[PDB]
Amino acid sequence: KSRQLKAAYSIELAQDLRAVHGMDADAELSGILATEIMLEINREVVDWINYSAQVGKSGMTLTPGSKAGVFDFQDPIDIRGARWAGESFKALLFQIDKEAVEIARQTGRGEGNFIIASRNVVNVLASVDTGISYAAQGLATGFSTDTTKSVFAGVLGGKYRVYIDQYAKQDYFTVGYKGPNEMDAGIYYAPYVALTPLRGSDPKNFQPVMGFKTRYGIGINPFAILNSLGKNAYFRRVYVKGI
Amino acid sequence: FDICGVQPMNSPTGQVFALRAVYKKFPALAASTQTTVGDIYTHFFQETGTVYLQASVQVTIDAGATDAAKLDAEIKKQMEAGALVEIAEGMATSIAELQEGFNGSTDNPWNEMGFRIDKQVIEAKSRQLKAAYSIELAQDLRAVHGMDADAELSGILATEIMLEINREVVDWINYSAQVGKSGMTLTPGSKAGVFDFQDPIDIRGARWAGESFKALLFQIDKEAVEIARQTGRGEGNFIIASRNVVNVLASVDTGISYAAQGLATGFSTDTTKSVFAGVLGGKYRVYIDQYAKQDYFTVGYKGPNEMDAGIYYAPYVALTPLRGSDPKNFQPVMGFKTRYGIGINPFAILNSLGKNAYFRRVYVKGI
Amino acid sequence: RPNLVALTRATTKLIYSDIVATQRTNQPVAAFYGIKYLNGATYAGEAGYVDREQITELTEESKLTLNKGDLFKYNNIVYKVLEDTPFATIEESDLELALQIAIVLLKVRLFSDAASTSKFESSDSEIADARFQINKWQTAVKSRKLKTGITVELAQDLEANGFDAPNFLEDLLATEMADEINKDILQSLITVSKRYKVTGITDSGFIDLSYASAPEAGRSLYRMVCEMVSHIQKESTYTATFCVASARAAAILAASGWLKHKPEDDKYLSQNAYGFLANGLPLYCDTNSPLDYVIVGVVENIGEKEIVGSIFYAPYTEFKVVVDPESLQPSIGLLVRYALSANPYTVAKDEKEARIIDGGDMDKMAGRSDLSVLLGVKLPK
Amino acid sequence: YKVLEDTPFATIEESDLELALQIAIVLLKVRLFSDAASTSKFESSDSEIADARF
C-alpha cells in the first residue's frame, strides 16, 4: 500500500527565497515535504490503532460508578476520589494501567508497552512521575534548536513508551502491546519503497512539483480492516474529558 | 530576542518568510437491533443531541422500545452496562478512515503537503534614543572617578534602546496573541480568559500555592496544546510573563530559571537585563516582562527555522551611533538608532489583533 | 543567474526603457525613488521668503506707490523698483502683464538675492530651503507569463527548422513578451500623464483635426506638441526628454515635415525609436492605444541615478524560460516580473497619504505625473 | 479598461461608442487596464497563461 505528497509551490517562492536570503528553496521545501510524509504515515498508524483498538474503560476495566469508555476529570469516580490535578492526573495513569492489563488478559502475550495520546493527555501524564516524559529540554534550553516532534517522550511508570498524537482529533489515550518479536505486534507496517522523490510542474503556470512516495503495506493480528474495527486485543482506547 | 524569526532586512521592504500552514452517517441505533461488537451506531437522545455508540456487547436494544423515550432509556442502561461506549469526533474520525480506506484508489491526486509558505512585506520601522549629557559630567566621570565617561552613557543608552525594542516586540506579541484560557482550553466552570488564584476552579481545588502554582502550569500546557493544534507545528516552546507569574513559576520544579541568583551570589555583579530567565519544567523557555502592566502570561511556539516562528524581528540597523553638539553651549549630542521592521504570520500588523495562532495570552489574578 | 540576464537583455532591449525611469530590484517589491515639490522662479530661501512678506504683495492699488530702490514681490519673484512710481506709465490693467512690461521698460528689475558674507553673518540669517523633496515608495513586483512556445507536432516542425529553432523560438517568446511589457508601460504612461490643457483643454476642447474640423497638414498638432513641451519646461525643472505617439497621432501624421524618419539610428536616437520630431525628443510609436494621442515628458537623472520620471520601472531577477514535457507536447513557458509605478507623493499632501497608496495604482496616479502631459487628439476616419 | 469614479461616460455626448471610449479614457473616466498581477495570484489560483499570438 502506497501514499504520496506533492510540494505544490511557486517559482517565485523559490526565487525570492534565494534572491532575498540565500535560501536553498527547493531543498528546504523538500525537507518539509519529507517530514510531512513521515508525519502522515505516523498518522496512519495511529488512525489504525484508534480503529482497531477495543473500547477501553469497559467490562473488566470499569469502575462500578464509571461512564463506559470515557475518563472525565470532572468526575470523582474516574479520579478515584482524587483531590487537585496532580492526584487526578495519576488516577488517569492508573486507568491506563488497567487498559494495559486487559490487553495482557486478552492477548495472552503481555501488558501494554506504549501509550498513544493527545497532547492534553500527554501533558497530564508528563506532569507526573517527576520527569519521565521529556520535553526534549535541550532544545528548549537553546531556544528551539529543533523541536524534534517525531519522538516518544518517555516510558511512563517505567512501563509505557508514550508518544504524542500530533493529529489527535477529540482528546484521548490508547494503550497498546508490542512483544520482542516482530510477529507479536498486533499491527504491522512493511516498507517496500520509501521517500522516493517525485518531480514535475503544472504547465498552466509552469509551477514546480516535488514530492515523496512510499509503499509499505499494513497488517493486523487477524482476530477474525473488517476484522479489526473495535476488535483488536492488542489495543484499547479511552476518550478523555475534563482536562 | 531569541523567540522570533529574524531574516534580517538588508533593505526596508524587505520581507520575512513564514511557514504558514495551508489552511459520517453511522447507521442509526434502534429498537430491536442487536448490535455487533466494534460496530458504531448513531443515536439521538431527546436530551443533548447525538453521540456515536460503539458496541462492546452484542445486545438487542429492547425490541419493544418504539417510543423514543423508552429507546433512550434502554440505550442509557446499555451505556451504563458498558455495552455501548460513548465518543463523538473520535468515532467520526475512525469511520472517516474506514470509508476512505475502503474507497481508496491510487489515481493521481498527489496530496499537497499541508503548507502554504509565504512572506510579508516588511518596512524597516525605526526607533531611537539620545544621551543628552554635559561636558562637565564627562570631564569628571573620567578625570575623578576613572570612568569612561560618555562611553558608559553610550553603553547604557544603547542597552535601553535594545531593551525598548525587545519590549515593543513583546507588545506586538501580546496584541496579536489569541485570547488564551478560552474555547478549547477552558474548564467548564471557568471565567473565560483569566486565571485567578483565588478561584478554586482555576486552581482545581489546590491546597495552597504549591498545588495552585502547578495548576497554573497546567493551564500553560493547555495553551501550548491549543497553539500546537492551530499552527500544526507543535507545542508552545516559550513563555512571556509578568513578574508575579515568573515568581510563581520560579518556585516550581526548583531550578527552572533565574531568580537573579547569579546577581545575588556575585553581590550585584551583572543584572543581565536582556535575557530569558530559564526553562519551565525543562519545556518552556521563559522571559520576565519587566514592563508588564498588570499580571499575565503568553505561551508561544518557535521552531528551528526562523520561518517557523510566527513572529518576526528583522534588524536592519542596530545601535548605530550619532554624534553632534549644540554650539550655543556646545553641550554634546550623542545617541543611537535602529531600523528593524516587525512581522507576524498574516492568519487571514495592526489587523492581527487576537488572531495569532502561535501565541495565547492569559490574564492572571490572585497571586 | 546569467540565463536570466541574457533573457532580460534579449527582451528589454525591445521596450521603451528610455521613456521611463529605470531602477532595479532584488526584492518582491521595488524600492522606488523620485523627486516632487511645490513651486517656479528665483530663490527658495526662508530669509528671502521673510523679505517677500516684509516688503509687499504688489497689489494693484499699491504697485505705483513704490519708488526707486523699493522691493516688491509677485508670484514669488522679488523685483527692485527702477526710478519712481513703477507701473504708473503702463496702461495694462492686468498686473501680471504690467509687470512683464515693467521689466522690459526697465521700470522694475528682476532682483538677485546673491549677497555678501556680511548680510548673512550679521543678520544671523536662514539658509535656502529645498526646491525639491526626495521621495521613496514601494511597489509590488507584478508579473505575466506566456505559454507560447508551442511544441508537439510543432516540435517536429521546429526540428525541421532546427537550424535556428531552439533559440529562435526563445527569441520569439522574448519578442512577444517585450511587446506586452512595453504596452503595459505605455498604458500606465498614458494614464499618469497630465492632460495638457489650454483655455479648458488645448484651445477649449481636445485638438480636433477631423474632417469636420481641421484636416490641414498636421501642422496644428505639431504646434500643440511644441506647446506641450513648453508646459513641461515651464512647470518641471528639466526639459521634455521624450515623446511617444501613435502613427495617426504623430508618428505618421507629422510626416508632412514635422517628423524625421530616423535618417540615422546611432546618433541621438535609440534602437527602438521610430525617429524624432522636428521639435526634438526621440519619438517612439505606440501603435496600440485607440486614442491616437501624443505624450511629452521627462525622464532624467542625477549623475547615474534615473530618479526623474513619470513612470518608474524596476525588474526583478534572481526573465525565466521553463519547459514542461506534458504528454507529447513539451511546451515552453516564459515568466517575467517587474515593479512599475509613478511617484505617489504627487497625489499626497504628506506621508500619511502617500503611505496608504501605491505608486503602481494607476487609478490614483491618473493625470498626476507632473513630468509629462498628454494631448488627446480627434482624428479623421 | 477600469472605471474611474462612478458612471463613466455620463458626461460624454458622443454616440459612437468607440469615440466615446477614446474620450472617456483621455478625460480619465476610464483607465487602460493591465492584467499584470501579483505572483501570488497567478500561482495560487492555478491560473491560465497567454497562448501565442503568433
PDB file of N, CA and C in Angstrom, chain A residues 3-6 13 16-17 20-21 23 29 32-33 36 48 51 55 58 68 84-85 87 89 119-120 123 127 135 137 140-141 143-145 147 169-170 225-226 229 237 243, chain B residues 2 7 15 17 38 54 79 82 85 87-90 93-94 97 102 110-113 115 117 119 203-204 207 211 214 218 221-222 225 228 235 237 282-283 285 302 304 307:
ATOM      1  N   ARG A   3       1.414   5.732  -0.505  1.00  0.00           N
ATOM      2  CA  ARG A   3       0.937   7.078  -0.074  1.00  0.00           C
ATOM      3  C   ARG A   3       1.921   8.125  -0.626  1.00  0.00           C
ATOM      4  N   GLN A   4       1.439   9.236  -1.208  1.00  0.00           N
ATOM      5  CA  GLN A   4       2.325  10.231  -1.802  1.00  0.00           C
ATOM      6  C   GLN A   4       1.853  11.672  -1.657  1.00  0.00           C
ATOM      7  N   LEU A   5       2.839  12.566  -1.511  1.00  0.00           N
ATOM      8  CA  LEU A   5       2.614  14.005  -1.397  1.00  0.00           C
ATOM      9  C   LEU A   5       3.347  14.805  -2.433  1.00  0.00           C
ATOM     10  N   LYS A   6       2.828  15.993  -2.724  1.00  0.00           N
ATOM     11  CA  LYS A   6       3.477  16.931  -3.625  1.00  0.00           C
ATOM     12  C   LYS A   6       3.813  18.265  -2.959  1.00  0.00           C
ATOM     13  N   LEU A  13       8.408  31.626  -5.274  1.00  0.00           N
ATOM     14  CA  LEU A  13       8.772  31.344  -3.908  1.00  0.00           C
ATOM     15  C   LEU A  13      10.221  30.969  -3.900  1.00  0.00           C
ATOM     16  N   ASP A  16      12.437  34.021  -4.657  1.00  0.00           N
ATOM     17  CA  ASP A  16      12.531  35.005  -3.615  1.00  0.00           C
ATOM     18  C   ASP A  16      13.326  34.435  -2.466  1.00  0.00           C
ATOM     19  N   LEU A  17      13.171  33.162  -2.163  1.00  0.00           N
ATOM     20  CA  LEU A  17      13.947  32.633  -1.060  1.00  0.00           C
ATOM     21  C   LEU A  17      15.441  32.766  -1.330  1.00  0.00           C
ATOM     22  N   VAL A  20      16.332  36.777  -1.867  1.00  0.00           N
ATOM     23  CA  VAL A  20      16.217  37.546  -0.660  1.00  0.00           C
ATOM     24  C   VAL A  20      17.176  37.100   0.442  1.00  0.00           C
ATOM     25  N   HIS A  21      17.248  35.802   0.772  1.00  0.00           N
ATOM     26  CA  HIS A  21      18.106  35.422   1.884  1.00  0.00           C
ATOM     27  C   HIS A  21      19.184  34.406   1.572  1.00  0.00           C
ATOM     28  N   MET A  23      18.515  31.456   0.561  1.00  0.00           N
ATOM     29  CA  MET A  23      17.936  30.196   0.982  1.00  0.00           C
ATOM     30  C   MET A  23      17.896  29.221  -0.173  1.00  0.00           C
ATOM     31  N   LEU A  29      12.115  23.103   1.107  1.00  0.00           N
ATOM     32  CA  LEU A  29      10.753  22.706   0.848  1.00  0.00           C
ATOM     33  C   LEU A  29      10.699  21.193   0.867  1.00  0.00           C
ATOM     34  N   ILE A  32      10.715  19.853   4.364  1.00  0.00           N
ATOM     35  CA  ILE A  32       9.381  19.967   4.947  1.00  0.00           C
ATOM     36  C   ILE A  32       8.509  18.842   4.448  1.00  0.00           C
ATOM     37  N   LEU A  33       8.541  18.632   3.149  1.00  0.00           N
ATOM     38  CA  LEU A  33       7.750  17.648   2.450  1.00  0.00           C
ATOM     39  C   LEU A  33       8.081  16.233   2.921  1.00  0.00           C
ATOM     40  N   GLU A  36       6.693  15.925   6.348  1.00  0.00           N
ATOM     41  CA  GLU A  36       5.260  15.819   6.330  1.00  0.00           C
ATOM     42  C   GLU A  36       4.818  14.431   5.933  1.00  0.00           C
ATOM     43  N   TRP A  48      -5.070   3.751  12.513  1.00  0.00           N
ATOM     44  CA  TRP A  48      -5.465   2.356  12.541  1.00  0.00           C
ATOM     45  C   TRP A  48      -5.522   1.849  13.956  1.00  0.00           C
ATOM     46  N   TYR A  51      -8.717   2.650  15.432  1.00  0.00           N
ATOM     47  CA  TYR A  51      -9.756   1.992  14.686  1.00  0.00           C
ATOM     48  C   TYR A  51      -9.903   0.613  15.274  1.00  0.00           C
ATOM     49  N   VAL A  55     -12.828  -0.801  22.730  1.00  0.00           N
ATOM     50  CA  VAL A  55     -13.124   0.270  23.662  1.00  0.00           C
ATOM     51  C   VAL A  55     -12.565  -0.066  25.034  1.00  0.00           C
ATOM     52  N   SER A  58     -14.071  -0.382  30.025  1.00  0.00           N
ATOM     53  CA  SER A  58     -15.209  -1.195  29.649  1.00  0.00           C
ATOM     54  C   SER A  58     -15.056  -2.623  30.128  1.00  0.00           C
ATOM     55  N   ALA A  68     -18.463   4.292  31.120  1.00  0.00           N
ATOM     56  CA  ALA A  68     -18.271   3.437  29.923  1.00  0.00           C
ATOM     57  C   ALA A  68     -17.418   3.990  28.774  1.00  0.00           C
ATOM     58  N   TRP A  84      -7.394  17.736  43.648  1.00  0.00           N
ATOM     59  CA  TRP A  84      -6.411  18.536  42.883  1.00  0.00           C
ATOM     60  C   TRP A  84      -5.881  17.745  41.683  1.00  0.00           C
ATOM     61  N   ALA A  85      -5.371  18.458  40.712  1.00  0.00           N
ATOM     62  CA  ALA A  85      -4.894  17.985  39.439  1.00  0.00           C
ATOM     63  C   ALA A  85      -3.831  16.925  39.496  1.00  0.00           C
ATOM     64  N   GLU A  87      -3.126  14.582  41.803  1.00  0.00           N
ATOM     65  CA  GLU A  87      -3.670  13.312  42.192  1.00  0.00           C
ATOM     66  C   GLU A  87      -4.593  12.804  41.088  1.00  0.00           C
ATOM     67  N   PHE A  89      -4.398  13.453  37.871  1.00  0.00           N
ATOM     68  CA  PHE A  89      -3.610  13.031  36.733  1.00  0.00           C
ATOM     69  C   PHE A  89      -3.104  11.618  36.959  1.00  0.00           C
ATOM     70  N   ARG A 119      -2.192  15.539  22.867  1.00  0.00           N
ATOM     71  CA  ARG A 119      -1.291  16.410  23.575  1.00  0.00           C
ATOM     72  C   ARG A 119      -1.781  16.755  24.980  1.00  0.00           C
ATOM     73  N   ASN A 120      -3.089  16.983  25.165  1.00  0.00           N
ATOM     74  CA  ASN A 120      -3.546  17.309  26.510  1.00  0.00           C
ATOM     75  C   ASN A 120      -3.291  16.146  27.423  1.00  0.00           C
ATOM     76  N   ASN A 123       0.375  15.868  28.332  1.00  0.00           N
ATOM     77  CA  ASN A 123       0.749  16.834  29.364  1.00  0.00           C
ATOM     78  C   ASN A 123       0.284  16.375  30.746  1.00  0.00           C
ATOM     79  N   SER A 127       3.104  15.486  33.498  1.00  0.00           N
ATOM     80  CA  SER A 127       3.093  16.242  34.725  1.00  0.00           C
ATOM     81  C   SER A 127       3.296  15.354  35.943  1.00  0.00           C
ATOM     82  N   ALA A 135      10.519  16.752  27.597  1.00  0.00           N
ATOM     83  CA  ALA A 135      10.204  17.884  26.757  1.00  0.00           C
ATOM     84  C   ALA A 135      11.269  18.122  25.706  1.00  0.00           C
ATOM     85  N   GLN A 137      14.228  18.956  26.484  1.00  0.00           N
ATOM     86  CA  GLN A 137      14.649  20.142  27.195  1.00  0.00           C
ATOM     87  C   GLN A 137      15.941  20.774  26.728  1.00  0.00           C
ATOM     88  N   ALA A 140      14.655  23.220  24.211  1.00  0.00           N
ATOM     89  CA  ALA A 140      14.017  24.362  24.866  1.00  0.00           C
ATOM     90  C   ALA A 140      15.093  25.298  25.421  1.00  0.00           C
ATOM     91  N   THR A 141      16.139  24.710  26.014  1.00  0.00           N
ATOM     92  CA  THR A 141      17.246  25.458  26.601  1.00  0.00           C
ATOM     93  C   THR A 141      17.924  26.334  25.570  1.00  0.00           C
ATOM     94  N   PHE A 143      16.559  27.618  22.940  1.00  0.00           N
ATOM     95  CA  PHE A 143      15.540  28.368  22.195  1.00  0.00           C
ATOM     96  C   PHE A 143      15.105  27.697  20.925  1.00  0.00           C
ATOM     97  N   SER A 144      14.669  26.452  21.056  1.00  0.00           N
ATOM     98  CA  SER A 144      14.168  25.666  19.942  1.00  0.00           C
ATOM     99  C   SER A 144      15.181  25.428  18.860  1.00  0.00           C
ATOM    100  N   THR A 145      16.278  24.785  19.235  1.00  0.00           N
ATOM    101  CA  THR A 145      17.340  24.456  18.275  1.00  0.00           C
ATOM    102  C   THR A 145      16.829  23.418  17.250  1.00  0.00           C
ATOM    103  N   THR A 147      12.681  20.936  17.407  1.00  0.00           N
ATOM    104  CA  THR A 147      11.506  20.674  18.213  1.00  0.00           C
ATOM    105  C   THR A 147      11.357  19.180  18.278  1.00  0.00           C
ATOM    106  N   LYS A 169      -7.776  14.174  17.287  1.00  0.00           N
ATOM    107  CA  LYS A 169      -8.943  14.952  16.916  1.00  0.00           C
ATOM    108  C   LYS A 169      -9.894  15.308  18.049  1.00  0.00           C
ATOM    109  N   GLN A 170     -10.150  14.386  18.971  1.00  0.00           N
ATOM    110  CA  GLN A 170     -11.005  14.795  20.113  1.00  0.00           C
ATOM    111  C   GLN A 170     -10.074  15.051  21.294  1.00  0.00           C
ATOM    112  N   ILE A 225      -9.568  -4.743   7.206  1.00  0.00           N
ATOM    113  CA  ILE A 225      -9.814  -3.968   8.421  1.00  0.00           C
ATOM    114  C   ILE A 225     -11.217  -4.281   8.929  1.00  0.00           C
ATOM    115  N   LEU A 226     -11.860  -5.161   8.194  1.00  0.00           N
ATOM    116  CA  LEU A 226     -13.200  -5.632   8.514  1.00  0.00           C
ATOM    117  C   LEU A 226     -13.202  -6.359   9.846  1.00  0.00           C
ATOM    118  N   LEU A 229     -12.009  -3.443  13.249  1.00  0.00           N
ATOM    119  CA  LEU A 229     -12.678  -2.308  13.901  1.00  0.00           C
ATOM    120  C   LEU A 229     -13.242  -2.629  15.265  1.00  0.00           C
ATOM    121  N   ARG A 237      -8.791   1.727  23.619  1.00  0.00           N
ATOM    122  CA  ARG A 237      -8.855   3.193  23.582  1.00  0.00           C
ATOM    123  C   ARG A 237      -9.899   3.811  24.494  1.00  0.00           C
ATOM    124  N   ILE A 243     -10.103  17.556  31.150  1.00  0.00           N
ATOM    125  CA  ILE A 243      -8.758  18.012  31.478  1.00  0.00           C
ATOM    126  C   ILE A 243      -8.801  19.512  31.690  1.00  0.00           C
TER     127      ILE A 243
ATOM    128  N   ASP B   2      15.278  36.122  21.107  1.00  0.00           N
ATOM    129  CA  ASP B   2      15.581  34.804  20.551  1.00  0.00           C
ATOM    130  C   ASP B   2      14.385  33.886  20.332  1.00  0.00           C
ATOM    131  N   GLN B   7      15.533  36.766   9.832  1.00  0.00           N
ATOM    132  CA  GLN B   7      15.605  37.020   8.418  1.00  0.00           C
ATOM    133  C   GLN B   7      15.831  38.510   8.196  1.00  0.00           C
ATOM    134  N   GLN B  15      11.143  41.836   3.568  1.00  0.00           N
ATOM    135  CA  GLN B  15      10.078  40.873   3.787  1.00  0.00           C
ATOM    136  C   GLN B  15      10.584  39.712   4.568  1.00  0.00           C
ATOM    137  N   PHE B  17       9.773  35.480   5.503  1.00  0.00           N
ATOM    138  CA  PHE B  17       9.093  34.242   5.185  1.00  0.00           C
ATOM    139  C   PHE B  17       8.563  33.547   6.422  1.00  0.00           C
ATOM    140  N   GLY B  38     -17.841  -3.807  18.072  1.00  0.00           N
ATOM    141  CA  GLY B  38     -16.935  -2.972  17.338  1.00  0.00           C
ATOM    142  C   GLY B  38     -17.694  -2.057  16.386  1.00  0.00           C
ATOM    143  N   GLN B  54     -20.450   2.688  20.440  1.00  0.00           N
ATOM    144  CA  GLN B  54     -19.781   1.500  19.929  1.00  0.00           C
ATOM    145  C   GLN B  54     -20.038   0.285  20.769  1.00  0.00           C
ATOM    146  N   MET B  79     -25.517   1.743  28.028  1.00  0.00           N
ATOM    147  CA  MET B  79     -24.321   2.540  28.181  1.00  0.00           C
ATOM    148  C   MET B  79     -23.768   2.316  29.589  1.00  0.00           C
ATOM    149  N   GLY B  82     -21.875  -0.750  30.051  1.00  0.00           N
ATOM    150  CA  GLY B  82     -20.628  -0.776  29.322  1.00  0.00           C
ATOM    151  C   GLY B  82     -20.801  -1.427  27.961  1.00  0.00           C
ATOM    152  N   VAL B  85     -20.368   2.140  24.255  1.00  0.00           N
ATOM    153  CA  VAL B  85     -19.422   3.213  24.588  1.00  0.00           C
ATOM    154  C   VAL B  85     -19.645   4.514  23.843  1.00  0.00           C
ATOM    155  N   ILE B  87     -18.468   8.179  22.378  1.00  0.00           N
ATOM    156  CA  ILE B  87     -17.386   9.030  21.825  1.00  0.00           C
ATOM    157  C   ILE B  87     -18.011   9.838  20.662  1.00  0.00           C
ATOM    158  N   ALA B  88     -17.565  11.077  20.365  1.00  0.00           N
ATOM    159  CA  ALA B  88     -18.198  11.746  19.222  1.00  0.00           C
ATOM    160  C   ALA B  88     -17.253  11.904  18.034  1.00  0.00           C
ATOM    161  N   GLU B  89     -16.419  12.933  18.053  1.00  0.00           N
ATOM    162  CA  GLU B  89     -15.487  13.139  16.968  1.00  0.00           C
ATOM    163  C   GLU B  89     -14.525  11.982  16.843  1.00  0.00           C
ATOM    164  N   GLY B  90     -14.165  11.376  17.966  1.00  0.00           N
ATOM    165  CA  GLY B  90     -13.242  10.263  17.920  1.00  0.00           C
ATOM    166  C   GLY B  90     -13.762   9.136  17.032  1.00  0.00           C
ATOM    167  N   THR B  93     -13.928  10.290  13.288  1.00  0.00           N
ATOM    168  CA  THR B  93     -12.599  10.199  12.750  1.00  0.00           C
ATOM    169  C   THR B  93     -12.305   8.773  12.294  1.00  0.00           C
ATOM    170  N   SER B  94     -12.595   7.787  13.154  1.00  0.00           N
ATOM    171  CA  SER B  94     -12.353   6.392  12.808  1.00  0.00           C
ATOM    172  C   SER B  94     -13.126   5.972  11.577  1.00  0.00           C
ATOM    173  N   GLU B  97     -11.776   7.261   8.319  1.00  0.00           N
ATOM    174  CA  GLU B  97     -10.684   6.448   7.804  1.00  0.00           C
ATOM    175  C   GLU B  97     -11.225   5.165   7.208  1.00  0.00           C
ATOM    176  N   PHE B 102     -11.432   2.022   2.435  1.00  0.00           N
ATOM    177  CA  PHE B 102     -12.123   1.117   1.533  1.00  0.00           C
ATOM    178  C   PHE B 102     -12.408   1.752   0.177  1.00  0.00           C
ATOM    179  N   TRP B 110      -2.060  13.562  -6.089  1.00  0.00           N
ATOM    180  CA  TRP B 110      -0.992  13.586  -5.113  1.00  0.00           C
ATOM    181  C   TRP B 110      -1.486  14.644  -4.153  1.00  0.00           C
ATOM    182  N   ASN B 111      -1.382  14.406  -2.854  1.00  0.00           N
ATOM    183  CA  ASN B 111      -1.908  15.397  -1.930  1.00  0.00           C
ATOM    184  C   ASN B 111      -0.843  16.403  -1.663  1.00  0.00           C
ATOM    185  N   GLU B 112      -1.179  17.653  -1.461  1.00  0.00           N
ATOM    186  CA  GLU B 112      -0.099  18.550  -1.157  1.00  0.00           C
ATOM    187  C   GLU B 112       0.314  18.415   0.285  1.00  0.00           C
ATOM    188  N   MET B 113       1.572  18.716   0.565  1.00  0.00           N
ATOM    189  CA  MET B 113       1.949  18.825   1.964  1.00  0.00           C
ATOM    190  C   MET B 113       1.098  19.956   2.485  1.00  0.00           C
ATOM    191  N   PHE B 115       1.072  22.858   3.717  1.00  0.00           N
ATOM    192  CA  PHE B 115       1.762  24.115   3.939  1.00  0.00           C
ATOM    193  C   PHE B 115       1.485  25.108   2.832  1.00  0.00           C
ATOM    194  N   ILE B 117       3.324  28.404   2.886  1.00  0.00           N
ATOM    195  CA  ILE B 117       4.648  29.023   2.838  1.00  0.00           C
ATOM    196  C   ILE B 117       4.566  30.353   2.072  1.00  0.00           C
ATOM    197  N   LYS B 119       5.278  35.108   2.477  1.00  0.00           N
ATOM    198  CA  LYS B 119       6.062  36.156   3.142  1.00  0.00           C
ATOM    199  C   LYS B 119       5.350  37.499   3.225  1.00  0.00           C
ATOM    200  N   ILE B 203      -7.744  26.818  40.052  1.00  0.00           N
ATOM    201  CA  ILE B 203      -6.666  26.111  40.702  1.00  0.00           C
ATOM    202  C   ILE B 203      -7.036  24.669  40.973  1.00  0.00           C
ATOM    203  N   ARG B 204      -8.129  24.195  40.400  1.00  0.00           N
ATOM    204  CA  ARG B 204      -8.554  22.821  40.524  1.00  0.00           C
ATOM    205  C   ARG B 204      -8.631  22.320  41.958  1.00  0.00           C
ATOM    206  N   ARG B 207      -4.543  22.899  47.213  1.00  0.00           N
ATOM    207  CA  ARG B 207      -4.267  23.219  48.589  1.00  0.00           C
ATOM    208  C   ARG B 207      -3.027  24.107  48.676  1.00  0.00           C
ATOM    209  N   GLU B 211       0.286  23.462  45.174  1.00  0.00           N
ATOM    210  CA  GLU B 211      -0.594  22.887  44.200  1.00  0.00           C
ATOM    211  C   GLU B 211      -1.180  23.943  43.261  1.00  0.00           C
ATOM    212  N   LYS B 214       1.200  24.752  40.463  1.00  0.00           N
ATOM    213  CA  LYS B 214       1.223  23.715  39.447  1.00  0.00           C
ATOM    214  C   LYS B 214      -0.026  23.815  38.563  1.00  0.00           C
ATOM    215  N   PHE B 218      -0.427  23.840  34.465  1.00  0.00           N
ATOM    216  CA  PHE B 218      -1.324  23.005  33.708  1.00  0.00           C
ATOM    217  C   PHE B 218      -2.082  23.890  32.711  1.00  0.00           C
ATOM    218  N   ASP B 221       0.250  24.514  29.887  1.00  0.00           N
ATOM    219  CA  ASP B 221       0.265  23.418  28.941  1.00  0.00           C
ATOM    220  C   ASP B 221      -0.952  23.408  28.049  1.00  0.00           C
ATOM    221  N   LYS B 222      -2.129  23.697  28.586  1.00  0.00           N
ATOM    222  CA  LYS B 222      -3.295  23.697  27.719  1.00  0.00           C
ATOM    223  C   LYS B 222      -3.123  24.672  26.585  1.00  0.00           C
ATOM    224  N   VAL B 225      -0.858  23.441  23.907  1.00  0.00           N
ATOM    225  CA  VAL B 225      -1.532  22.496  23.058  1.00  0.00           C
ATOM    226  C   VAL B 225      -2.393  23.198  22.049  1.00  0.00           C
ATOM    227  N   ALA B 228      -0.295  24.328  19.474  1.00  0.00           N
ATOM    228  CA  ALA B 228       0.178  23.259  18.641  1.00  0.00           C
ATOM    229  C   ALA B 228      -0.802  22.831  17.604  1.00  0.00           C
ATOM    230  N   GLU B 235       3.789  21.986  20.158  1.00  0.00           N
ATOM    231  CA  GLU B 235       3.589  22.738  21.412  1.00  0.00           C
ATOM    232  C   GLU B 235       4.411  24.005  21.533  1.00  0.00           C
ATOM    233  N   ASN B 237       6.809  26.722  22.895  1.00  0.00           N
ATOM    234  CA  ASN B 237       8.161  26.499  23.360  1.00  0.00           C
ATOM    235  C   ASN B 237       8.652  27.516  24.365  1.00  0.00           C
ATOM    236  N   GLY B 282      11.672  22.375  32.082  1.00  0.00           N
ATOM    237  CA  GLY B 282      12.544  21.883  31.045  1.00  0.00           C
ATOM    238  C   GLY B 282      11.834  21.999  29.687  1.00  0.00           C
ATOM    239  N   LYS B 283      10.623  22.546  29.666  1.00  0.00           N
ATOM    240  CA  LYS B 283       9.852  22.645  28.452  1.00  0.00           C
ATOM    241  C   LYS B 283       9.734  24.029  27.839  1.00  0.00           C
ATOM    242  N   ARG B 285      10.905  27.970  27.412  1.00  0.00           N
ATOM    243  CA  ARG B 285      11.885  28.985  27.740  1.00  0.00           C
ATOM    244  C   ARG B 285      11.090  30.193  28.245  1.00  0.00           C
ATOM    245  N   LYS B 302       7.961  28.322  18.706  1.00  0.00           N
ATOM    246  CA  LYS B 302       9.088  28.677  17.857  1.00  0.00           C
ATOM    247  C   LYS B 302       9.815  27.440  17.351  1.00  0.00           C
ATOM    248  N   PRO B 304      12.961  25.540  14.811  1.00  0.00           N
ATOM    249  CA  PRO B 304      14.381  25.733  14.496  1.00  0.00           C
ATOM    250  C   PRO B 304      14.629  26.658  13.341  1.00  0.00           C
ATOM    251  N   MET B 307      11.589  30.869   9.907  1.00  0.00           N
ATOM    252  CA  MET B 307      10.283  30.942   9.291  1.00  0.00           C
ATOM    253  C   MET B 307       9.246  30.075  10.007  1.00  0.00           C
TER     254      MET B 307
END
